[PDB]
Amino acid sequence: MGKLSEQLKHCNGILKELLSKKHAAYAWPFYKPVDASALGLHDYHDIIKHPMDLSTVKRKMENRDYRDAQEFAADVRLMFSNCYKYNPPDHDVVAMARKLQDVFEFRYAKMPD
Numbered sequence: 001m002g003k004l005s006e007q008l009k010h011c012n013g014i015l016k017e018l019l020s021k022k023h024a025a026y027a028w029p030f031y032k033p034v035d036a037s038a039l040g041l042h043d044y045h046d047i048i049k050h051p052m053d054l055s056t057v058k059r060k061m062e063n064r065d066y067r068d069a070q071e072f073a074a075d076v077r078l079m080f081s082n083c084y085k086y087n088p089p090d091h092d093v094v095a096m097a098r099k100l101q102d103v104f105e106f107r108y109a110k111m112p113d
């Protein structure tokens with residue numbers, strides 16, 4: 001549905017990396033939408049108004065929902081922010097989020113322009 005812009009190509013590369021086996025040890029909690037019912041997190045949707053995850057970002061990229069790199073970045077950061085909002089700062093999943101966000105932020109900073 002049309003070639004991605006040069007900056008969105010970079011974003012797509014980053015997304016591929018975040019989903020790759022390379023980072024699976026800490027990326028796995030972010031692969032799919034939080035299933036609040038299944039995990040017994042019955043307050044999750046009261047606290048997190050805009051859930052986000054990497055599969056949703058992937059779908060949006062494929063569907064050309066993102067019009068620029070900034071919109072893509074906002075969803076990725078929304079995902080991490082949701083994790084930092086819902087979970088205590090000493091939780092294992094928060095440590096994983098910080099590590100995956102480090103991967104994201106450092107490569108996002110290498111955006112071509």
Ligand SMILES: CC(=O)N1c2ccc(-c3cnc(C(N)=O)nc3)cc2N(Cc2ccccc2CO)C[C@@H]1C1CC1
Nearest residue numbers: 028029030034035039041044082083086087092093096
């Ligand atoms: C994305 C996010 O904020 N969350 C999060 C999202 C998804 C999953 C997850 C759990 N199980 C499976 C599975 N069954 O394969 N896949 C993903 C787990 C979490 N963790 C739990 C969790 C993460 C990592 C290590 C240990 C645990 C303790 O169980 C909590 C949190 C949550 C409180 C909001």
